């Protein structure tokens, strides 16, 4: 553990919160009959709730005095105390997806501007071209460093200034 | 048909197909492997 | 001939202009001693909606 | 009591003169342009500072600018 | 539907049923008229889709194929007689019939 | 009427009256001005603001001594409530005077919220006579300054321009005398007077020469045994007034708080202002003034130019830019003063310097909120007055290649990066709050994204807090930083920080994480709104020459797609909305986190501050119960004045929306219609205005509506802050 | 023109019942404007202040309180009916001034007699910064 936080398995308030959230459904389940569809819906919600709590405990999460799980952000403490999947690993997952959107839109912009009437290509897209680039962007990091090391990424003082 | 495909290539329509894909993909990703928070 | 050639692209150097450090086609050039003879046409509009403007010899330079 | 200054980039379009309602702009001959015309601002005492003229100017940047300043009865457009 | 969260909105309304509580008054409208079963609502829905396509067809017909002239539109006096007697008059007389033969006996 | 401007006097409308007030103290734009007459008129006016300060302080002393309960408060500071000033409102009824007479005084009164009672009591004031004597002293000092502003304006006694532009002499005299000697004397007061008054001894003008502060006297000071003054410090079991548990020390380095009065030791603060006097006197002897020794300011700036050329020419050409530009000097002063004003807010609540201030919950709030709100207003002025420099007092050819031109050259990069930070901070902060608002709503409070602020908890562990268990150097006994300062400050410091019943380094959770991130978004975006109005003050692509028009103008017209709100004044105008929004969050976070501490239930904030409905339910709606019942149909309590003000703010805030939303053109056509009626009416037409009526200008309405907007944004919270905290008394 | 036409203060006015957009106390005290024109037939036209009025065959005369009210009418007559109006300025003292076709030719057409005014021989921009003129008025002049 770290930062004076208990694991969620050993916490009492964590189990208190489980017994509470299930008690609401059991009271709500008493109204309806056993074989009815409202009964099946609530039993599934009961099954999901029981699964949500045990999985968060199994994953070595850290619960505070309030009883709710807390996340850790420094990769040093995350890797040292086995909490990397929380924040440190979600960061790489998103950046790969965010870069993919940039490398794709940047290429559609450059290529349509090499032809006549690029304004029409923005409001009326070339879907065959857009899908081609969208399935060619799996290795977007390679092309970026290829384009940076080459020097064809940035423009050089051919841009408008104001003074 | 050439003009119909061109209408379908407008911005309002291509965006509609994008939205059904991204929203359909995420809702389907929550229906199976329900309510994710920590990534294993 | 006094100035750049017809149909030649040139780069602008007016600091005031919307098209500064940008490229445009030379539409025409007047050789009657006018202060701002060089007529230039750009694809992109300015804020008002005008895509042409008469520039001078010193205010224009070769492309890129 | 507004200020109206016209600059060297005028081309003799006359669109500034046609626009301003209060007849504060007129055309004068000149040797600088193809049209051999230039504007002028003899009577700015009647300038209401509407700034319609600047809109008419079709140059890269305005050859006609209306620098607002001290107000008056004629400038404030007061019928009373 | 049953997705992340959401289902709690299907409250314990009553009647062996759980869902969102409406405030449109449709149930009191369908009871003021003679409606006891769900089969009467299904037919009523299929009629609207049939009449709606007729409406949409009309707009294509009255514009793309056979469109009236300006003279037809300026016959304002004709429009008032048809709108007053035909639409508001017979429309109300018709409703009375349904109320007398269905909305009252039910 | 404006004599300083003939252009407005010729104006026949009411615009003359409004613009005459707003351009009153703008000396640069006046008619017939000169650079020499400018500095003199400023120097005389700056004497005036001193005269109002010393009088404003004199009024509080008199109105407290004459009408307050300072003599009764010292005997029982905790239970007795202070009294600011009495009330005489003949429109009252009998139930109100019975409710507003809660104090021991006969008539109705207003309970104080500033905290001057705790301050005066600490420095050795224990009677109402001593406040009467003081109120006379400042009123004399106030009159002296008024006489000087007039005297130093006369034909003689009129300083020359070279005298104002002598920076090296001003620094040395102001750093050494105004800062140092004043700090040295304040130590002379704490030693000769205040510490004795704490330990029972009555020291005053009658007996300060006969009474020694220390038994030994000054013989340790000359001999070099300076540790004799720290021998017998005050014990923990020490009453602040009586000699029970006293000591003989005058300078000590105990650290921490005094046990009974949760406040800093007086002997420490005496030792503090002494060392500050030494550094500031030493720094005062730095620059060169009429003797061979000393540094020169211009020689330094010209020298600090890096060789490679990362900064080009460097800091060259800047001395004549700063020394000649008053707006430059004013932006730096506000920037520095604005920041300091926030330190006063952040460092007082954590380190109470006064006696029985930690217990006065209502007083800590007001002081923290008042300093924080002023901090933002002062900070906004520094940028705004920094933008005017670029228009009026900036010379590009002189400042060529230097740092100031190299910043202005690539401004598109700065404004771009600032925009990205605000966008990323805003999208993520709003998202986390929403994601938790929903997932709470579906009954699953465990699916929230609660991230622990590990980096801040790492500091508190490195500063003595053993809760988190990081076991850092200063939380570890083996480290040298614990070994050093073990005899000095750490026993008193470690006891306080580890105590979880004070505001010194409060516990942090994931709720405090989101609030800090939300603040960052406000600070970054507020700077972006201001920075843009400064750098783009000289010109934009939409308006290449803003500099010719001025700082404040309407617009350039409906041409070029529309140019409404381009001027740098309109950037400052929009930043104030964000400023108030930023300080609001900062202040909402202080109040609730402290209420839960004072009420004892800290779990309220930790669990509910993670989702927005907690802020609306548990903080706003809940604590607005005793306040709203100030005047009920059954009766009225003492909080009726606050509920009335409560609404008064809600109303003023809404009236500004008129001037903001509805523009001029709707109104001027309306005033033309009333003018027609006034002339066509049979008898009223005989009366005729002297100045023609016209609607308010464009820029005037932006100003007026912002005043109605900010006053409601302050009067509303002040009532809520004082009423919520006063009614619960915790 | 060849010569300035002096004002005939007694000419028939159009047929107009009246309105509330007329002249106020400013007119008798400070100044007011009057416009003249010559029509070939009887027509209907929109007034700047108020509603519709009927012109009269021959000379016509109106009185207004603003120059914009007069020039607003010239633009209507020159475009719709293709006429040539001329308007003056009358002070309270009785003095009269002939304003708009001051040269006889409308301003949108050149004439050799005119002389330029407020003509800077430089480009927009390209002018001194305000610091150079910090203590007197004007950066553009
Ligand atoms: C390929 C499209 C594209 C690309 C590559 C970029 C890239 C960039 N933008 Mg950006 N932007 C875009 C579209 C794009 N933008 C659009 C459509 C808008 C209008 C909403 C903006 C508004 C915007 C602002 C206000 C700012 C940026 C900024 C930036 C820079 C920092 C990243 C950022 O936080 O931006 C912000 C990201 C967004 C606002 C999200 C954009 C919306 C989607 C996610 C992207 C559009 C993709 C496109 C529609 C798909 C076409 C693909 C094609 C095959 C059909 C960065 C270099 C910041 C900057 O100045 O850098 C310092 C900044 O302040 N952008
Ligand atoms: C976006 C506009 C809008 C929307 C969304 C709704 C929605 C709704 N309306 Mg409403 N309505 C509207 C506009 C709208 N209305 C307007 C402008 C009027 C003024 C005429 C009415 C008059 C109206 C009435 C009188 C009633 C509703 C009712 C209802 C509710 C039941 C829906 C229904 O099918 O009942 C169907 C409605 C009926 C079967 C009876 C309609 C009787 C009216 C008087 C017919 C008049 C039609 C006539 C030819 C048009 C006016 C003639 C012209 C000369 C003025 C529902 C919540 C009903 C309700 O309360 O729900 C319980 C209800 O009685 N509406
Ligand atoms: C050391 C402090 C200091 C000093 C010496 C100055 C000096 C100056 N400032 Mg500056 N300023 C300061 C701090 C300071 N300022 C701060 C902190 C800010 C940020 C808020 C500003 C923001 C600022 C702006 C935005 C402008 C100036 C301007 C000026 C110039 C004078 C304008 C004038 O005469 O206005 C006189 C104005 C008034 C008399 C009207 C003030 C009325 C206030 C707003 C109403 C307050 C509300 C009301 C009384 C509340 C009552 C409560 C009710 C319930 C009873 C002058 C150089 C102006 C300038 O230089 O123009 C180029 C200008 O435009 N200043
Ligand atoms: C303590 C604050 C303070 C100080 C020191 C001054 C000082 C001054 N004011 Mg000022 N003034 C103030 C507050 C203050 N004013 C407020 C709050 C208002 C609004 C009611 C005004 C409205 C005002 C006007 C309208 C005028 C002055 C003028 C003056 C100058 C008169 C010469 C003596 C002097 C510099 C006069 C001036 O411009 O002198 C040069 C002048 O005409 N002041
Ligand atoms: C700026 C300083 C300052 C301020 C704000 C006040 C404010 C006030 N004084 Mg005060 N006063 C002051 C300095 C000040 N005093 C000084 C220096 C003296 C000594 C002469 C007095 C002597 C004084 C008397 C004798 C009285 C007031 C009274 C008042 C109140 C009357 C209402 C009003 O319009 O004022 C008000 C609370 C009157 C009152 O009834 O207070 C409740 C009253 O009778 N004052
Ligand atoms: C930072 C310096 C400083 C400050 C703010 C104070 C503040 C105070 N002292 Mg203290 N004191 C100081 C230094 C200081 N002292 C030093 C160095 C000593 C050692 C001698 C003392 C010894 C002392 C005694 C013995 C007594 C005080 C008392 C007081 C209190 C009332 C004073 C009063 O009403 O004026 C009354 C003022 C006079 C009788 C005349 C003062 C004469 C000086 C030399 C004039 C200074 C004017 C100064 C230049 C003003 C600045 C403006 C300038 C441009 C003109 C007040 C809290 C009295 C008290 O009751 O406190 C508990 C008291 O009896 N003080
Ligand atoms: C512009 C982005 C940004 C900004 C302005 C801030 C600003 C702030 N953060 Mg912070 N933070 C950020 C991003 C950001 N953060 C990210 C992406 C994470 C990981 C999810 C964190 C995790 C974090 C924690 C755990 C804590 C703070 C805290 C703070 C406050 C004190 C500074 C500090 O020590 O934090 C750290 C400063 C940084 C991490 C700078 C990194 C910003 C990078 C360059 C942007 C993202 C790059 C991308 C991920 C790759 C401060 C106001 C502390 C606090 O809450 O105060 C009590 C604290 O405990 N932050
Ligand atoms: C709470 C905010 C607020 C207030 C107080 C007002 C008030 C008013 N509005 Mg606005 N309105 C508002 C919000 C507000 N509006 C907003 C945000 C918008 C934006 C859409 C509009 C847009 C708007 C428009 C377009 C118009 C109005 C009009 C009016 C005026 C109508 C005449 C009237 O009833 O006055 C009566 C007086 C009052 C209602 C004030 C009530 C408070 C009491 C009675 C005053 C007490 C005075 C006190 C005894 C004297 C103290 C003196 C002291 C110095 C000692 C009125 C002054 C209309 C107008 O002005 O033309 C007639 C106009 O057409 N409103
Ligand atoms: C039409 C009804 C109405 C209206 C129009 C208002 C309007 C207003 N009320 Mg109000 N109020 C009302 C009813 C109403 N109230 C009722 C019925 C009650 C209970 C009796 C209250 C009790 C109340 C209190 C106690 C207060 C107000 C305040 C305010 C003003 C704050 C405005 C603002 O923008 O500040 C800024 C708005 C915010 C800072 C956000 C609002 C609160 C959020 C949720 C806190 C979030 C902080 C945290 C950092 C998260 C945000 C970060 C973000 C990035 C996610 C405002 C003008 C406040 C005030 O006086 O202004 C200072 C104030 O303290 N009201
Ligand atoms: C109502 C309104 C007016 C008209 C408002 C007027 C004419 C009211 C001002 C005059 C009254 C008589 C002053 C009322 C007295 C004040 C309550 C106290 C003023 C105190 C000062 C003397 C210090 C505008 O001119 C305007 C202009 C631009 C945007 C919005 C608006 C706008 O909303
Ligand atoms: S400010 Fe208005 S009235 Fe004056 S010249 Fe320009 S367009 Fe004409
Ligand atoms: S400020 Fe008013 S007049 Fe000026 S551009 Fe904006 S809307 Fe038009």
Q: How does this model look, in words?
A:
This is part of a larger assembly, with seven protein chains of seven kinds. Chain B has 40 residues and is mainly alpha-helical. Chain B has one domain (1-40): Single alpha-helices involved in coiled-coils or other helix-helix interfaces (Up-down Bundle). Chain B has helices spanning 2-8, 11-31. The longest helix of chain B is centred in the middle third of the chain and has 21 residues, at 11-31. Helix content of chain C is 0%, strand content 31%. In chain D, strand 2 (26-29) and strand 3 (37-40) form a beta hairpin. The two termini of chain D are 18 Å apart. Chain D is elongated, with a radius of gyration of 13 Å. Chain D is an alpha+beta fold. Chain D has helices at residues 15-19, 52-56; strands at residues 3-6, 26-29, 37-40, 64-67. In chain G, the strands form two sheets. Chain G has a four-stranded antiparallel beta sheet. Chain G has a two-stranded antiparallel sheet with strand order 2-3. In chain G, strand 2 (44-46) and strand 3 (52-54) form a beta hairpin. Chain G is of the alpha+beta class. The two termini of chain G are 32 Å apart. Chain B binds chain E through residues 27, 30-31, 34-35, and chain E through 3-4. The complex binds chlorophyll A (9 copies), phylloquinone and iron/sulfur cluster (2 copies). Residues 429-430, 433, 515, 518, 521, 581, 584-585, 588, 612, 615-616, 620-621, 624, 628, 649-650, 653, 712-713, 716-717, 720 of chain F line the site of one chlorophyll A.
Task: Provide the fold topology.
The structure is cut from a larger assembly and holds seven protein chains of seven kinds.
Chain B: H1 2-8, H2 11-31
Chain D: E1 3-6, H1 15-19, E2 26-29, E3 37-40, H2 52-56, E4 64-67
Antiparallel strand pairs in D: 1-4, 2-3
Chain E: H1 26-32, H2 39-65, H3 70-73, H4 76-103
The complex binds chlorophyll A (CLA) (9 copies), phylloquinone and iron/sulfur cluster (2 copies).
PDB class: photosynthesis
Keywords: membrane complex, photosystem I, dunaliella, light harvesting, excitation transfer, photosynthesis
Entry title: Dunaliella Minimal Photosystem I
